[PDB]
């Protein structure tokens, strides 16, 4: 009947926190080169077996749009690019007037044989060289004709060292002691809210940081039904994030057997120009089985009417705005940067009641200003030989149209301008909390009296 407060140390209490998180990668050390952009020299090796620990009776809220982990990975990825770009060859001298001509007379020409003076090793001597340039990287200025690189009026440019690789490898994330990562095990997880089935982990799953646009690649998938996650579905301004239940297959090729020209532009500095194409000159593309794509859209309009009425007209259209990098399924494949016309996909109309694979034309750039970033642009060096990379589509990014004639019908086109939106596709299942091991409760236990 005598109540006394009593102290307990190591009690299961935690609080939501924004803290400094850490990297995690398999301790595979395949250096046997000098590559590796993401894992770097010493990202901490992963646990052999993760101790994903289920928590009985525990119900926790997740919100992927107000998540601090997304807004961290995004900045985490950014610093690595600059850190990998700094020691490389800066192409300040490639802004000379370029004299370019068309390649092909058997027209059935998007690429230029470009001659220009350059700097040699000796400061006084100059050189006339030729390189091949894709049309997007270059612009005409005023008889010859005379041209320049697209970047020279926006920003300086630096060339990625050839040694570095652009391949996303799965990267986990581990929390320091006193913190914890909470992981939602709900299959039907709404965009936001409380997840009834919760496990705790020291590190997240292997998140492949595939930077891509309009479509998520080599990601993590969704169980049961395809998942529609928005911050607000009914709000057009907030995007609509989609996670697939079945992965589809994509084969991407740059079908010309290109060649690399090492041009010395100073002591140590060396520019990697695009040499003569060998074999046919073919345009890059990607196929996706048309059959599989009709299947995948059905699961979508099915999860859609659960949020739009059993009957309404749901059609798909192509992108209608943005930069060239947002109008296209932009991605990187093997080290060349692809930008693909997606109109054959988002062309159908759905009434909600062989392979014959669709081919997508793709343009290619070597000058890139990624992350909607103005300032340091990059020269992706030409990749010697033909390119072919296989990527799954593990998701989508869509967006609805504004106010029409009473919503008669609803229309969906892609695009993902923020990049975090790609990270949310792999981070919806995680949340950060800080550990509070101190609990106070009233008991009849009293300490022995001092007197």
């Amino acid at each position, epitope marked *: 009947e005598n109540l006394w407060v009593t102290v307990y140390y190591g009690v299961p209490v935690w609080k939501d926190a924004e803290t400094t998180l850490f990297c995690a990668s398999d301790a595979k050390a395949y250096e046997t080169e000098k590559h590796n952009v993401w894992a770097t020299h010493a990202c901490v090796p992963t646990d052999p077996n993760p101790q994903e620990i289920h928590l009985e009776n525990v119900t926790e809220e997740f919100n992927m749009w107000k998540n601090n982990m997304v807004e961290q990975m995004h900045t985490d990825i950014i610093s690595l690019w600059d850190q990998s770009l700094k020691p490389c060859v800066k192409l300040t001298p490639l802004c000379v007037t370029l004299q370019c001509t068309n390649v092909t007379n058997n027209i059935t020409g998007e690429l230029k044989n470009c001659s220009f003076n350059m700097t040699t090793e000796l400061r006084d001597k100059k050189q006339k060289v030729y390189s091949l340039f894709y049309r997007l990287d270059v612009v005409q200025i005023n008889s010859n004709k005379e041209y320049r690189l697209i970047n020279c009026n926006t920003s300086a440019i630096t060339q990625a060292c050839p040694k570095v690789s652009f391949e996303p490898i799965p990267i986990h994330y581990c929390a320091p002691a006193g913190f914890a990562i909470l992981k939602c095990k709900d299959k039907k997880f709404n965009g936001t809210g409380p997840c009834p089935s919760v496990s705790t982990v020291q590190c997240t799953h292997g998140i492949k940081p595939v930077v891509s646009t309009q479509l998520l690649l080599n990601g993590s998938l969704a169980e049961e039904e395809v998942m529609i996650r928005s911050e607000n579905i009914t*709000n057009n301004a907030k995007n609509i994030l989609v996670q697939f239940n079945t992965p589809v297959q994509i084969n991407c090729t740059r079908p010309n057997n290109n060649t690399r020209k090492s041009i010395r532009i100073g002591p140590g500095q060396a520019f990697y120009a695009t040499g003569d194409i060998i074999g046919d000159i073919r345009q890059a593309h990607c196929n996706v089985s048309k059959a599989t794509w009709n299947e995948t859209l059905g699961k979508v309009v099915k999860q859609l009417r659960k949020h739009f009425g059993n009957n309404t007209i749901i059609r798909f259209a192509n992108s*209608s*705005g943005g930069d060239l990098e*947002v109008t296209t399924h932009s991605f990187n494949c093997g080290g060349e940067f692809f930008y693909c016309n997606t109109s054959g996909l988002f062309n159908s109309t759905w009434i909600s009641n062989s392979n014959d694979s669709i081919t997508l034309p793709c343009r290619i750039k070597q000058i890139i200003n990624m992350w909607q970033r103005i300032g340091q642009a990059m020269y992706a060096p030409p990749i010697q030989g033909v390119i072919r990379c296989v990527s799954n589509i593990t998701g989508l990014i869509l967006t609805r*149209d*504004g106010g029409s004639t009473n919503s008669t019908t609803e*229309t969906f086109r892609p695009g993902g301008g923020d990049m975090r939106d790609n990270w949310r596709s792999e981070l919806y299942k995680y949340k950060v909390v800080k550990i509070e091991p101190l609990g106070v409760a009233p008991t009849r236990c009293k300490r022995r009296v001092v007197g």
Partner: antibody
Amino acid sequence: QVQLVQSRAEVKKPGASVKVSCEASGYNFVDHYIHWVRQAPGQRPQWVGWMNPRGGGVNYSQRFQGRVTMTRDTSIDTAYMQLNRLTSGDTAVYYCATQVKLDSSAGYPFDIWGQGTMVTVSS
Amino acid sequence: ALTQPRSVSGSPGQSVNISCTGAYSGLGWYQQHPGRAPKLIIYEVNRRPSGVSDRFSGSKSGNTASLTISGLRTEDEADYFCSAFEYFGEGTKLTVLS
């Protein structure tokens, strides 16, 4: 600070195009969307579009797709819009705006408003 | 279909009763003075935007919003409007009989 200013009023005739600027200042233009609304002197306002500078992307009220084109110039913190196939039926007051100083990240609604550009279409 | 009253009688020192019915209605409430520059009065339905007068507040329903004013003035003689995301209600010319 935190304000919208639009190009000068115009009068154009049927078929013709029209481009209107909306110079923005006092906030970091890039982060927030930008919608455009049309008031006729004598009917409601008819939303048209939005365009984040970060990606430059859009979507237009189906009453309006195709005829319209919205453009930005982040070098200068400014947006634009161009309306083609002008008919007399589209003469109205055109205001640019955005939500910035709210505490509603849901993009809606709009509080910060250009004075407007009046466009008369009539032969 | 987004709708609201068209005209409302009023007078100084009084209170005015207006409506708006529609799905997700009463997202914000505006005031256009004859001429230019419409202006947001209350975001959401009951959110005094930081930087307006306090005698402003709003109520709503599952589909019907309602904006409320005390101590009317001739300064509030203008057209008043109901925002619904993409869609904008018809338009009430509030008259303050002075």
